[PDB]
Design a protein around this ligand. Sequence first.
Ligand SMILES: [Mg+2]
Ligand SMILES: [Mg+2]
Ligand SMILES: [Mg+2]
Ligand SMILES: [Mg+2]
Ligand SMILES: [Mg+2]
Ligand SMILES: [Mg+2]
Ligand SMILES: [Mg+2]
Ligand SMILES: [Mg+2]
Ligand SMILES: [Mg+2]
Ligand SMILES: [Mg+2]
Ligand SMILES: [Mg+2]
Ligand SMILES: [Mg+2]
Ligand SMILES: [Mg+2]
Ligand SMILES: [Mg+2]
Ligand SMILES: [Mg+2]
Ligand SMILES: [Mg+2]
Ligand SMILES: [Mg+2]
Ligand SMILES: [Mg+2]
Ligand SMILES: [Mg+2]
Ligand SMILES: [Mg+2]
Ligand SMILES: [Mg+2]
Ligand SMILES: [Mg+2]
Ligand SMILES: [Mg+2]
Ligand SMILES: [Mg+2]
Ligand SMILES: [Mg+2]
Ligand SMILES: [Mg+2]
Ligand SMILES: [Mg+2]
Ligand SMILES: [Mg+2]
Ligand SMILES: [Mg+2]
Ligand SMILES: [Mg+2]
Ligand SMILES: [Mg+2]
Ligand SMILES: [Mg+2]
Lengths: 113, 59, 117, 101, 154, 138
Amino acid sequence: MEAKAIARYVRISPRKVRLVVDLIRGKSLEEARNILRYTNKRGAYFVAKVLESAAANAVNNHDMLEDRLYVKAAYVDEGPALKRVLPRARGRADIIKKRTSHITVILGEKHGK
Amino acid sequence: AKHPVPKKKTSKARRDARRSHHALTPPTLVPCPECKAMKPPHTVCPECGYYAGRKVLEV
Amino acid sequence: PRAKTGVVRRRKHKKILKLAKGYWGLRSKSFRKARETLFAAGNYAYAHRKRRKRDFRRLWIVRINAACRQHGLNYSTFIHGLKKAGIEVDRKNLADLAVREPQVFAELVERAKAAQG
Amino acid sequence: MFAIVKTGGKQYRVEPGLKLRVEKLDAEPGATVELPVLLLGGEKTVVGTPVVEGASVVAEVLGHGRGKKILVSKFKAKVQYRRKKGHRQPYTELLIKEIRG
Amino acid sequence: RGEVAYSGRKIWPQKHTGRARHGDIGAPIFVGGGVVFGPKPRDYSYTLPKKVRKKGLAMAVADRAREGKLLLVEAFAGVNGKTKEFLAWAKEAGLDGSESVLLVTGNELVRRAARNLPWVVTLAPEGLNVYDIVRTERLVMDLDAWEVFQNRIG
Amino acid sequence: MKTYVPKQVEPRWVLIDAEGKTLGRLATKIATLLRGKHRPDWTPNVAMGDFVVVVNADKIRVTGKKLEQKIYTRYSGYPGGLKKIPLEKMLATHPERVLEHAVKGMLPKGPLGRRLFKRLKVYAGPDHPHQAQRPEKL
RNA sequence: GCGUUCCCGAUGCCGAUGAAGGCCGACCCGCGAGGGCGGCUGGAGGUAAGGGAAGUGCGAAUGCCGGCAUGAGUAACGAUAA
RNA sequence: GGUGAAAAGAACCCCGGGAGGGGAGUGAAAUAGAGCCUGAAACCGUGGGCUUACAAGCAGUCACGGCCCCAAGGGGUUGUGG
Ligand SMILES: [Mg+2]
Ligand SMILES: [Mg+2]
Ligand SMILES: [Mg+2]
Ligand SMILES: [Mg+2]
Ligand SMILES: [Mg+2]
Ligand SMILES: [Mg+2]
Ligand SMILES: [Mg+2]
Ligand SMILES: [Mg+2]
Ligand SMILES: [Mg+2]
Ligand SMILES: [Mg+2]
Ligand SMILES: [Mg+2]
Ligand SMILES: [Mg+2]
Ligand SMILES: [Mg+2]
Ligand SMILES: [Mg+2]
Ligand SMILES: [Mg+2]
Ligand SMILES: [Mg+2]
Ligand SMILES: [Mg+2]
Ligand SMILES: [Mg+2]
Ligand SMILES: [Mg+2]
Ligand SMILES: [Mg+2]
Ligand SMILES: [Mg+2]
Ligand SMILES: [Mg+2]
Ligand SMILES: [Mg+2]
Ligand SMILES: [Mg+2]
Ligand SMILES: [Mg+2]
Ligand SMILES: [Mg+2]
Ligand SMILES: [Mg+2]
Ligand SMILES: [Mg+2]
Ligand SMILES: [Mg+2]
Ligand SMILES: [Mg+2]
Ligand SMILES: [Mg+2]
Ligand SMILES: [Mg+2]
């Protein structure tokens, strides 16, 4: 059994968040939180936050039991970019694109033999 | 928009290869004698403060 | 009536791309880089199908040589001996006799230097 | 034993009981047996004896299931302004089961 | 590209944009653009040799007849143009409906009657024509019509 | 249909001492041996020739004049240096190379060729402190 | 020759026991263009034999419209009055 | 431009400031959940199989060999040789 979360349209850029999601892929939820807690990155906030939601769901909706659970897989996917103008010299006008993320965490439970 | 400019779209491969160093390092962390907590070495942290430590508050 | 591209093109493309599966960059991903790669591949195979016929000739001839030079003499002498003896046999291919059952080959050698003695 | 038959303009080492393809033979029925040209002995206790196109009476008997098969390849020719695919070659095959030396 | 709603202003300098050379956006490389050899309204009719028309109509009936599918009726007990009636009539006429019939008469009423039937293609005698003849399996005409036909050709 | 191919074979060492020989006429043989062109298993994609040890280089004879006649360009340094060293000298100082260069030269260009050259063991003999199988070919 | 759109064929025929379209296929047919057959998706259309008619087949036109890449986590974030 | 036959447009609970999501519920169907039918391709990701740090390239092709899913054969991969 697994439990998942997904934040959609987060509005940080994938490349940027992926970086921290890579940090927690496959750790105990404990380790996960600790790591995010002291990871110096905007993405920390977001990822952690959806970690938490995943955990909740797990325990609360899938009688899953905190102590036992880790990050089975995680991953961020690109959402639709917000395209803004950015004016340049000689009146050129480029389009900057603030990108947008879909973060996904899915926890499982670990052992017991 | 001017003088030097790249002559070829750079392959996924070569893009990714460049990024073989971009991976993040997990924060470095430790016990804290008073809390079962985790804090960076050589820092006070929001509980534990210290033995003769300054901090939030403690009784 | 209008007849828009509709389906057609996508399909003709997938066809080519199916063929280009396995190739490197967009050579396997680009419905045209693929087609470029494919032309070459076609020619190479045609060229190479003819090549194969020779690649093996050579193996064999080297096979034979090492083995009959092993009883002391040229592939060339050996072959002439055979010709002179009459032996549609061998077919450079079937001097694998050189390897499995040497006794056979050995005799063949004698025959070869027989018609040369 | 052994034996080096010649057929399809190619020669093969045929063994006590096997086969591969040889090329369409006028052996119209599958339920048949042709014997093909012998060409070198075999070496066992039955012999070890070769000869000048082995026209030594001895034949190899082979029966054969079969059907003019096919396969694939695809022969594309290309230049520059010239392409030709108009060859899917498959190639009539003839399967066999060799019976005795 | 002329019939099109746009302007004719030429969109770019033509010479140092560093874009492709272009005129107005009507030109058919454009999407916005106008159609190239599009269809226009046209008249597909042509005068097929009167004689051939005659030959054909003859040839057509002929055929249907050499098959045993031509029938000249006379008895139309069907009246006031009532489908029930034509039906019953077509019954003891042989026309059961397993065969498409081109009923040709001048009888306005027999038209009305046989009209709405899916397996019947009703037609006045001056309407006799090969397409209809061939469309249908069986051919049924009142001598009335068979005369005007015999009179479209003698 | 047939085929030919060999299953992994145990390599066979060999010891030769062309102490008196013309390098290159010697070397030519040493190569044929390196790639297994003498064995009738020969298979070109696979690398299965003798191992080949050679005591007594120095010694190797050489035809006409190659006193500062035969010159080993061989070394392009990198910036302005095409170091060239005459045959006498090689022998005079690390002479095992004379036969090495020779053999490497008549070996095929690929990874495999690169590999076979490793299988060659040349010592300014006699004595190839190194053998636990030496079987002298001539 | 193949295939696309449309008409006759059609008051027909195929179709929720699944149309078109999409994704697979190492199978069958065809020299090939293609055509089949099977699985998955899809959820309402499709349309033989044989003919008829065309807005009928794209890789290139510094083509056109759109989407998304590369450069790149790079230059930069607009007065050095803090 | 287009959810669905019908808003039946998701009460309520859970994490979250919210957005978002997880359950619950409606629905024949919810990867029909609201710029929602179908949902191709470029492009971005996650997992897996084979592969790779002495090697020289229009990137393929031909032959052999090794490993990985079915068995006188196929499929995927690619080490070396041409
Ligand atoms: Mg301005
Ligand atoms: Mg850009
Ligand atoms: Mg990649
Ligand atoms: Mg078109
Ligand atoms: Mg020319
Ligand atoms: Mg105008
Ligand atoms: Mg003007
Ligand atoms: Mg330009
Ligand atoms: Mg330009
Ligand atoms: Mg228009
Ligand atoms: Mg005309
Ligand atoms: Mg009617
Ligand atoms: Mg239409
Ligand atoms: Mg039905
Ligand atoms: Mg059914
Ligand atoms: Mg259609
Ligand atoms: Mg056109
Ligand atoms: Mg062209
Ligand atoms: Mg563009
Ligand atoms: Mg840079
Ligand atoms: Mg910099
Ligand atoms: Mg900077
Ligand atoms: Mg509606
Ligand atoms: Mg679906
Ligand atoms: Mg749906
Ligand atoms: Mg619908
Ligand atoms: Mg959709
Ligand atoms: Mg992967
Ligand atoms: Mg090296
Ligand atoms: Mg290596
Ligand atoms: Mg390399
Ligand atoms: Mg190669």
